[PDB]
């Protein structure tokens, strides 16, 4: 051949049990809003009801984990204390 690849340096991202398509706290969907929002709108204050991303790389509706921090505080899918780093998606 005329051009042959010798080296490569991809960077491979990874996702834990985020289950893209369901939230582990309320079980609704990665979208479709949450249990504390019901319909997509239903007074969602300009769609502020967004997804929250932990350091453990799990994902839930911001609302569903926020309310889980008024009772527990250690991420239900492992044991890590859980942080609030990345947001949205």
- Which residue positions form the known binding site? 23, 26, 34, 37, 49, 56, 58, 61, 63-64, 75, 78
Question: Is 8 a binder of other proteins (CB under 8 A)?
Answer: yes
Give the pairing of strands 51-53 and 59-61. Answer: antiparallel
Question: Is 32 a binder of Zn ion (CB under 5 A)?
Answer: no
Identify the helix (H) or strand (E) that includes residue 62. helix 62-66
Q: Which is nearer to other proteins, 26 or 56 (CB)?
A: 56
Distance CA 38, CA 32 (A): 8
The dihedral region occupied by 83, where left means phi > 0, alpha psi between -120 and 50, and beta the remainder, is: beta
Classify each residue of 53-70 as buried b or exposed e, where b means 16 or more C-beta atoms within 10 Å of its C-beta: bbebbbbbbbbbbeebee
Tell which one of 40, 41, 81, 85 touches other proteins (CB under 8 A): 85
Minimum CB separation of residue 70 from Zn ion in Å reads 14
Q: Which residues bind other proteins (CB under 8 A)?
A: 1-17, 36, 43, 45, 48, 50, 53-57, 62, 66-67, 70-71, 83-89
Q: Which residues bind Zn ion (CB under 5 A)?
A: 23, 25-26, 34, 36-37, 49, 56, 58, 61, 63-64, 75, 77-78
């Amino acid at each position: 051949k005329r051009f042959e690849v010798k080296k490569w340096n991809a960077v491979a991202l990874w996702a834990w049990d985020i289950v893209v398509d369901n939230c582990a706290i309320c079980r609704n969907h990665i979208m479709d809003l949450c249990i504390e929002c019901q319909a997509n709108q239903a007074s969602a204050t300009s769609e502020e009801c967004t997804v929250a991303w932990g350091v453990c790389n799990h994902a839930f509706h911001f609302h569903c984990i926020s309310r889980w921090l008024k009772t527990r505080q250690v991420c239900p899918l492992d044991n890590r204390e859980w942080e609030f780093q990345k947001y949205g998606h």
